[PDB]
Design a protein around this nucleic acid. Structure first.
Ligand SMILES: [Cl-]
Ligand SMILES: [Cl-]
Ligand SMILES: [Cl-]
Ligand SMILES: [Cl-]
Ligand SMILES: [Cl-]
Ligand SMILES: [Cl-]
Ligand SMILES: [Cl-]
Ligand SMILES: [Cl-]
Ligand SMILES: [Cl-]
Ligand SMILES: [Cl-]
Ligand SMILES: [Mg+2]
Ligand SMILES: [Mg+2]
Ligand SMILES: [Mg+2]
Ligand SMILES: [Mg+2]
Ligand SMILES: [Mg+2]
Ligand SMILES: [Mg+2]
Ligand SMILES: [Mg+2]
Ligand SMILES: [Mg+2]
Ligand SMILES: [Mg+2]
Ligand SMILES: [Mg+2]
Ligand SMILES: [Mg+2]
Ligand SMILES: [Mg+2]
Ligand SMILES: [Mg+2]
Ligand SMILES: [Mg+2]
Ligand SMILES: [Mg+2]
Ligand SMILES: [Mg+2]
Ligand SMILES: [Mg+2]
Ligand SMILES: [Mg+2]
Ligand SMILES: [Mg+2]
Ligand SMILES: [Mg+2]
Ligand SMILES: [Mg+2]
Ligand SMILES: [Mg+2]
Ligand SMILES: [Mg+2]
Ligand SMILES: [Mg+2]
Ligand SMILES: [Mg+2]
Ligand SMILES: [Mg+2]
Ligand SMILES: [Mg+2]
Ligand SMILES: [Mg+2]
Ligand SMILES: [Mg+2]
Ligand SMILES: [Mg+2]
Ligand SMILES: [Mg+2]
Ligand SMILES: [Mg+2]
Ligand SMILES: [Mg+2]
Ligand SMILES: [Mg+2]
Ligand SMILES: [Mg+2]
Ligand SMILES: [Mg+2]
Ligand SMILES: [Mg+2]
Ligand SMILES: [Mg+2]
Ligand SMILES: [Mg+2]
Ligand SMILES: [Mg+2]
Ligand SMILES: [Mg+2]
Ligand SMILES: [Mg+2]
Ligand SMILES: [Mg+2]
Ligand SMILES: [Mg+2]
Ligand SMILES: [Mg+2]
Ligand SMILES: [Mg+2]
Ligand SMILES: [Mg+2]
Ligand SMILES: [Mg+2]
Ligand SMILES: [Mg+2]
Ligand SMILES: [Mg+2]
Ligand SMILES: [Mg+2]
Ligand SMILES: [Mg+2]
Ligand SMILES: [Mg+2]
Ligand SMILES: [Mg+2]
Ligand SMILES: [Mg+2]
Ligand SMILES: [Mg+2]
Ligand SMILES: [Mg+2]
Ligand SMILES: [Mg+2]
Ligand SMILES: [Mg+2]
Ligand SMILES: [Mg+2]
Ligand SMILES: [Mg+2]
Ligand SMILES: [Mg+2]
Ligand SMILES: [Mg+2]
Ligand SMILES: [Mg+2]
Ligand SMILES: [Mg+2]
Ligand SMILES: [Mg+2]
Ligand SMILES: [Mg+2]
Ligand SMILES: [Mg+2]
Ligand SMILES: [Mg+2]
Ligand SMILES: [Mg+2]
Ligand SMILES: [Mg+2]
Ligand SMILES: [Mg+2]
Ligand SMILES: [Mg+2]
Ligand SMILES: [Mg+2]
Ligand SMILES: [Mg+2]
Ligand SMILES: [Mg+2]
Ligand SMILES: [Mg+2]
Ligand SMILES: [Mg+2]
Ligand SMILES: [Mg+2]
Ligand SMILES: [Mg+2]
Ligand SMILES: [Mg+2]
Ligand SMILES: [Mg+2]
Ligand SMILES: [Mg+2]
Ligand SMILES: [Mg+2]
Ligand SMILES: [Mg+2]
Ligand SMILES: [Mg+2]
Ligand SMILES: [Mg+2]
Ligand SMILES: [Mg+2]
Ligand SMILES: [Mg+2]
Ligand SMILES: [Mg+2]
Lengths: 189, 148
RNA sequence: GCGUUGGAUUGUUCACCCACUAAUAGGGAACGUGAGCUGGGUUUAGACCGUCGUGAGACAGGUUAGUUUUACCCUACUGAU
RNA sequence: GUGGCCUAUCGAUCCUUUAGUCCCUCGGAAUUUGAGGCUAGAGGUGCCAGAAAAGUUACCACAGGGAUAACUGGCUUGUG
RNA sequence: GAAGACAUUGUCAGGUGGGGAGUUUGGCUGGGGCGGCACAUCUGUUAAACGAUAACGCAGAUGUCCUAAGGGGGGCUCAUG
RNA sequence: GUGAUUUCUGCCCAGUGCUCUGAAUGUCAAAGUGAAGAAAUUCAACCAAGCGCGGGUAAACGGCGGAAGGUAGCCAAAUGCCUCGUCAUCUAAUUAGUGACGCGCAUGAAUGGAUUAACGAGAUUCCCACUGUCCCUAUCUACUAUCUAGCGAAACCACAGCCAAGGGAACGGGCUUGGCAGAAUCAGCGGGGAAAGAAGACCCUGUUGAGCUUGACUCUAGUUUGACAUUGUGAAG
RNA sequence: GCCCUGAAAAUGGAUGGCGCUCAAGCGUGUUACCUAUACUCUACCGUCAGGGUUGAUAUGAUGCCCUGACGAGUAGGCAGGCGUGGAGGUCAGUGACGAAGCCUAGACCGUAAGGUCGGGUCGAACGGCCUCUAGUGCAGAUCUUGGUGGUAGUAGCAAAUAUUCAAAUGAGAACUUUGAAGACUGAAGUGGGGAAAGGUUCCACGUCAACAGCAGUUGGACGUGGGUUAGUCGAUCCUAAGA
RNA sequence: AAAUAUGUAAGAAGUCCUUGUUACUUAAUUGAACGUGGACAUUUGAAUGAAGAGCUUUUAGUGGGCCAUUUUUGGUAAGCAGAACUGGCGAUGCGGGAUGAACCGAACGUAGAGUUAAGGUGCCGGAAUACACGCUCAUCAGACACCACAAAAGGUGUUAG
RNA sequence: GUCGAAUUUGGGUAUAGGGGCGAAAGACUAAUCGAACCAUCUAGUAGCUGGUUCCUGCCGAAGUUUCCCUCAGGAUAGCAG
RNA sequence: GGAAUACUGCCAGCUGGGACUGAGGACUGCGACGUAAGUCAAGGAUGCUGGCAUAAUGGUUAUAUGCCGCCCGUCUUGAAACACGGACCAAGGAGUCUAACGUCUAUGCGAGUGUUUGGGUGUAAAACCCAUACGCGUAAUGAAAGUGAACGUAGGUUGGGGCCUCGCAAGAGGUGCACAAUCGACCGAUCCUGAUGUCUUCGGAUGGAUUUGAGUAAGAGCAUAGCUGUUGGGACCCGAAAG
RNA sequence: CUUAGUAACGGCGAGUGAAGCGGCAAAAGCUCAAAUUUGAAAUCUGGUACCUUCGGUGCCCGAGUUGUAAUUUGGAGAGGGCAACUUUGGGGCCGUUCCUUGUCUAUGUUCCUUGGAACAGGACGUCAUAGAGGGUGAGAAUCCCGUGUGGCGAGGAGUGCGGUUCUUUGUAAAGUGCCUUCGAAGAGUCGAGUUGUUUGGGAAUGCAGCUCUAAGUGGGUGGUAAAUUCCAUCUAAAGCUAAAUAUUGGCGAGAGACCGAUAGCGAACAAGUACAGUGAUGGAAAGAUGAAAAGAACUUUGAAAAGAGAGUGAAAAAGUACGUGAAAUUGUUGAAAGGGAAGGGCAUUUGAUCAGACA
């Protein structure tokens, strides 16, 4: 059962696995179904763009916080700063998320600009029903794409103050490690 | 394909290559990793030393994202600059025209110093740096800026 | 070459006596011979006793009851065309 | 002179426990208990490369074995 | 009529429990069993003058003992007649 | 549990069980209570039943020697190894039978001992009558077998079917060397075909089972004991 | 030294047999002769190794050619090939003027797996080559299903006392019908009715391929029809163990 | 104190002359180790041979053996049990031993010719009823290794000493 | 053997698989009993027995070492392609 | 005293009879005989002649004769076995597919590589096109906190194919990739040394150590496919007593 | 898709094993309880009459204050005060979107040969947004049905919406600024101990039994038990909700490098049928005459079944035991051999039989 110089393998097939095998024979069929469903939904919703406008947010975690992506919806504060109510925003094609909060001025200002540009690029048909026939744009994300914010200029002058970056990192670790013991010794005295 | 397998060659040879004496039985020696300490010990002590036992200390609810820190050496530092712009910066090695390299935007966490860089000033922004890497960058006239 | 027996007890081979007789010599043939017989013994399952075992049970110890199948083929043999 | 003049006198993983280092971790941040790691020993497997283990079957079962006993035959002839 | 905050019932805890359940009940071996250990080791011999070398071969031994019976130095010489 | 009647059922409570209005300061769960600590926690005291200790119990399990040492009886008995025991009787001759004898391998008292008229498709020995069981075979009847007309299977089958010796997987129809050997056949016959009927029920092996037993290992229904809940009201020591 | 005594086993018997005596026996010496898939030389097949040759105007430089050596084989490994169902491409492939399949002690090619042709039978599809793919090759498994032998015109068709003569019918009578005779069951029957169970087996006409282990004109067979009549006999009602 | 087996050496990674390094070593430039430079070529350091030598990865089957000569243990012995070296069978036909897994000879592509091995040449049966010197007469002669058995003790049988 | 009774027997009814029933043989429970029958889990597992399908060419073994509840099996080294 | 003969050996002395073989396919080579031309037995057979032209040779098949040949498959040290399966014939009948992997090989690209989750598109399960991520690789080492790979032509020495210089050649010198051995240097772990400076306990510079790592030292990997091997799966096919 | 065979669990053995982030498909939000309408229960089932009938109106009982409507669900929100503008609701009809259906919409059967049959071969044409497929006496684009491209109808569903038309809903409703006072938010429940089970969850992941049982700047969580001090993050013990996902059943369709009557479902057939079992259950075998029955009139032999002729057909070498018709096994005829098997190998004789070249 164990022979030769081979890696240790862990193949989890000791249950009735053959009863739960899923082969995606309908991969091509489902692609046709999704394309048909998108086409019939676009014809149903008039010239509406088939998707709602989304804000730009910072991804969490230290690993992914260097990038911005699309969030669920604009906050109540962002909607209010744009000059309209949340209820009217939902009926006009804007996603609203009540549980997200604003703590960064850069993110808040950018989402305010997105709402203002969106309002100036759409036409809202009156409730009377005359309904002038306008061409349908199938995507709002492509019309309003998300770009990573600029960080630094291409070239700049060298400014060295004589300090050491390695020394700065080492001292930062040391201060955090011994903060508790230093306070106790100071308090006991 | 079946037509190239040795099963086709074994047609008409009785034992199908498994021998007359030993034969091909179901599971002589057990199934899987059975008998790793009793009758398969020699094959485990060699080719797999360290298999049995425990060493370190446990860590409940590990999150690999906390330990994300890809490393980049100095010998590949200039590859982060587009090729069309590398040549002009190399030939124009001077202050107040030093290129800025943001290694975090390239997906790197710590800068290590292994190779040798050209004697050209460069502004390197990184989260972490080794002691040797900073010295070589400063020796060429550049600086390291810590970011978060 | 030719003969080498009749009986009491025992499942007995063996053994031991009675008697007759010229004589009651020893052996082999898959320890000749069970589709030839017989089935008393051994050696399935029931049951009893003694000793042993806490017990289920054991005993090359004793005791009693316990299904013996098929030839029309080939050859051999005996006779017959 | 790194135990007994020499050739034998002995023991893994897991777990427990002790000594050392007073060092590393408890992952939102700290102090103190507690717990978990690092290095070196001890508690033992004598079936001694180390499963935790009482019988009976004459009511019996299965896979096999002439690799193996209870008849002849063959070799041997101590014994007769 | 009796009985009474006790019985009863519910949940944990200790005992009892082959009535019942599940499982186990080494190996080597001139068959197996009983015995023995040739199962981890040591000395001499079998062993055929390098080394290696079998049998339930032959004659024995080991699971200890010692603050000295360990280490160094000095002086001395034993059995027996 | 023993197993009609008659007669009689001895001694042993140390062991294993069963049982007790017996004793107390042994062992002892959870809850509760106390101390220590900042707490987790730790330690200590108290402490139910059972166990332990003490008594009873053999027509309970069982024992009866060189806790008590087999009493009354009975026996080479369905129980005695040695053993075909010894003596007597029965026969011409008896490993049989019967009557006695008993240091009885290993008889024995309701795990019942001994004795018993009647009864028994039970197990044994002898005698009379009787007979083909035998000396020692012979003969008769019916139906088969046999032959014909019609009807018409099965077992089994590597290929097949004459011997002697040899060697060989140590017992050949075939191989080697010899003997020999002539179509097609019928009724019989049980020497051989290590004939046929079944993957040996005996024996061993397998890290294959099952039935049954027991202070084997690990558990469990039930039952018992304590705590808490159900669970309130009044008084006293 | 040779010979002899010592020297006894079971079916008949083996210097291999016959047979052999100045041997065809024993000891020893000298020559001739016989024959293995061994040795020597030659041809051919294959394998391995070392080499030669791109220069057009003729086809395979995985081609052609030169030189030397070698060849046993279970378990097992590797290499080059043969055959089968289906798929892409190609041969503007074969075919009702006969495709496939089958039969053929007829012919040819290959060491072989196999391939090709003629003759007969037959009636509607099928093949070569380059590649792809697999539910791809049978003598065995007390293999599965189906079919068929030897045995073999053989074992056998022998319990329950027993049949016989004549006529009628019919292609056909030991077995059907009628008559006559001889027998048996012997009233706890081989008689006369029923309960369960069966389900049309009851009755008539027609009728014999199969069934009645011989026969058959007969039948509980086959075909076509007919037949079971209740206020009083039962069910229905009652309660039993119980459900 | 053998025989048979058994370790090492027989050159270039060698020998020689001079002198550089070090924290080791010496009373000490004493030594040790490692080097710079110079001198000595393949009768370059015995024999014979060498379908080339060196090296790596991967994986099948097998892990019941048995026999013969010699050495050898237990056992009265065994076609018994157990070891040592080598050769065989197993896995292998072919000629010989009548016959036989292991003995003798010899190992195999398809054929032709020649010559042999072991074993044979009265007949079966291919080949001298050849040659030569002796021995033996059996009322149970004898006849070819492994191998299919015979002893102690005897004979004025006959032969030689 | 027994034959007027612990007799024989029809129909109705009750007891169902670790259960029933047993004047007790491990007997009987639909030809099935020391634990019935039917379907499924289930193609249950097997170090054990049997079988395992075309040709030619080249090379070509092992029954030995160490460890294993190892002794009819594996791992490991060797031999082979 | 002089010969002969026997025995053994040698001759690049001569010559007769018999058998088997004829491979190759212009020339080329080495020799012989010749003043010459030429010839020849000199790197493999030609010349002459007869009969028959078909079943005559030959093939196939049946039979006869000589010698030889035991029944296949299977387990086994050993099978023709008195060991097991097999009366006969037809058809069916057993190493498969999948997930994850080792070695090797082919292909694309290469410090990178992978279009097919999904989107676009379409002659519609095909083909064609594409963003962002993610996987693996490009850094290791510690239990962990953590730290993190150049003294030097990315080192020295020995052996190295190829190339360069000189040389007729033989050789000598120079340069030396891959690879092999060895001594160093660098990174992490462990054990020591503890500078400038201090939240007076922080900080850890510098220099060491018969210690240790699946490391560095001018990258090799990623993807697809194939044979072979591994593990889990019914797992090459058929088979238990049980639960 | 990935994280990942990873953290972790495990006689730490055999084995087991998630989650956050990141890319993508699909996207959608919400409402009760807890407040006095209190200058007016403003709410609702049912009955009855009528009507524009998936309902409406009037009237009358009843339910209900032990709470039915309006108003407010934590993102908030409510009671007062001030100043401002912004926006409508409910039905007919005609079309569109979708589904279920019907109908219409090209081109040779022209010559020759073979054949029973032309749908074969050969010659000469036509159509093609139709050369998919099937049928018709053999391989048919053009003989028939269809196929391709379009036109013209018939009957419904859903109000998704493209136009027209009838009703003013309403001193109605909703949104937005500022000041002030407030801001009710779910109990045998959270949580805790213990027991059992379960999980990767480890001083205990979820679930359940028993015991104990909260708080309101509170409560839960922050993957190592505890005390103390902070921080972060949500708001339990009440409720509704499309799409992306699943589908060996049902109904309607389209396909395959799948099987081809011992295969493929057990079943291509009067198949879950015949048949077996008391019962639960078990469970087969079985497809092919020919284009067309044209299925053999009539004669003759026989009691009859049938036979022999005749006849039908392209073929009775297709006769309802029917396409093709292999092997085992069997009959007849012909040839050969045979003294207790047969069969085989090498070589040649004899008999039979046969190809090749006559250059
Ligand atoms: Cl191969
Ligand atoms: Cl016992
Ligand atoms: Cl006769
Ligand atoms: Cl061929
Ligand atoms: Cl039941
Ligand atoms: Cl012959
Ligand atoms: Cl570390
Ligand atoms: Cl726990
Ligand atoms: Cl169906
Ligand atoms: Cl049934
Ligand atoms: Mg082979
Ligand atoms: Mg096999
Ligand atoms: Mg094996
Ligand atoms: Mg297998
Ligand atoms: Mg062990
Ligand atoms: Mg006998
Ligand atoms: Mg008999
Ligand atoms: Mg007999
Ligand atoms: Mg017999
Ligand atoms: Mg008897
Ligand atoms: Mg008995
Ligand atoms: Mg001493
Ligand atoms: Mg935490
Ligand atoms: Mg051991
Ligand atoms: Mg143990
Ligand atoms: Mg044996
Ligand atoms: Mg004697
Ligand atoms: Mg309770
Ligand atoms: Mg039990
Ligand atoms: Mg044993
Ligand atoms: Mg030695
Ligand atoms: Mg009495
Ligand atoms: Mg007595
Ligand atoms: Mg007596
Ligand atoms: Mg008594
Ligand atoms: Mg014989
Ligand atoms: Mg013999
Ligand atoms: Mg025989
Ligand atoms: Mg013979
Ligand atoms: Mg003969
Ligand atoms: Mg007879
Ligand atoms: Mg016989
Ligand atoms: Mg057997
Ligand atoms: Mg059996
Ligand atoms: Mg074992
Ligand atoms: Mg068991
Ligand atoms: Mg002679
Ligand atoms: Mg030869
Ligand atoms: Mg050879
Ligand atoms: Mg070969
Ligand atoms: Mg044809
Ligand atoms: Mg034939
Ligand atoms: Mg046809
Ligand atoms: Mg197959
Ligand atoms: Mg077959
Ligand atoms: Mg075979
Ligand atoms: Mg068979
Ligand atoms: Mg008869
Ligand atoms: Mg007869
Ligand atoms: Mg009879
Ligand atoms: Mg009669
Ligand atoms: Mg009578
Ligand atoms: Mg009468
Ligand atoms: Mg009738
Ligand atoms: Mg009849
Ligand atoms: Mg008849
Ligand atoms: Mg009828
Ligand atoms: Mg084996
Ligand atoms: Mg032996
Ligand atoms: Mg073998
Ligand atoms: Mg011989
Ligand atoms: Mg001759
Ligand atoms: Mg009765
Ligand atoms: Mg019994
Ligand atoms: Mg299987
Ligand atoms: Mg099975
Ligand atoms: Mg070879
Ligand atoms: Mg075996
Ligand atoms: Mg001829
Ligand atoms: Mg012959
Ligand atoms: Mg002959
Ligand atoms: Mg012969
Ligand atoms: Mg054997
Ligand atoms: Mg054999
Ligand atoms: Mg067998
Ligand atoms: Mg058989
Ligand atoms: Mg077949
Ligand atoms: Mg097959
Ligand atoms: Mg495969
Ligand atoms: Mg079990
Ligand atoms: Mg699980
Ligand atoms: Mg559960
Ligand atoms: Mg844990
Ligand atoms: Mg924990
Ligand atoms: Mg819901
Ligand atoms: Mg079928
Ligand atoms: Mg037809
Ligand atoms: Mg025809
Ligand atoms: Mg036909
Ligand atoms: Mg035939």
């Amino acid at each position: 059962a164990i022979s030769k110089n081979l890696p240790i393998l862990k193949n989890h097939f000791r249950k009735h696995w053959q009863e739960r095998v899923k082969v995606h024979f309908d991969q091509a069929g489902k692609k046709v179904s999704r394309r048909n469903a998108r086409a019939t939904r676009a014809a149903k919703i008039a010239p509406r763009p088939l998707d709602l406008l989304r804000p730009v947010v910072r991804a969490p975690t230290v690993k992914y916080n260097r990038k911005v992506r699309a969030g669920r919806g604009f906050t109540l504060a962002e909607v209010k700063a744009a000059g309209l109510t949340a209820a009217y925003a939902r009926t006009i094609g804007i996603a609203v998320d009540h549980r997200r909060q604003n703590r960064n001025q850069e993110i808040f200002d950018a989402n305010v600009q997105r709402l203002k540009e969106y309002q100036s690029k759409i036409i809202v048909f009156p409730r009377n029903g005359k309904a002038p026939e306008a061409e349908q744009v199938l995507s709002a994300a492509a019309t309003f794409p998300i770009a990573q914010p600029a960080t630094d200029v291409e070239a700049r002058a060298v400014q060295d103050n004589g300090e050491s970056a390695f020394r700065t990192l080492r001292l930062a670790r040391s201060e955090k490690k011994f903060r508790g013991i230093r306070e106790k010794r100071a308090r006991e005295k | 394909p079946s037509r190239f397998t040795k099963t086709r060659k074994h047609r008409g040879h009785v034992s199908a290559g498994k021998g007359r004496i030993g034969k091909h039985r179901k599971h002589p020696g057990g199934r899987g990793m059975a008998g790793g300490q009793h009758h398969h010990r020699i094959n485990m002590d060699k080719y797999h030393p360290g298999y049995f036992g425990k060493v370190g200390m446990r860590y409940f609810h590990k999150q690999q994202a906390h330990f994300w820190k890809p490393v980049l050496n100095l010998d590949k530092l200039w590859t982060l600059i587009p090729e069309d712009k590398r040549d002009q910066y190399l030939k124009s090695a001077s202050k107040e025209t030093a290129p800025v390299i943001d290694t975090l935007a390239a997906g790197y966490g710590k800068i290590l110093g292994k190779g040798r860089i050209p004697n050209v000033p460069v502004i390197v922004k990184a989260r972490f740096v080794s002691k040797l890497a900073e010295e070589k960058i400063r020796a060429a006239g550049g600086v390291v800026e810590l970011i978060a």
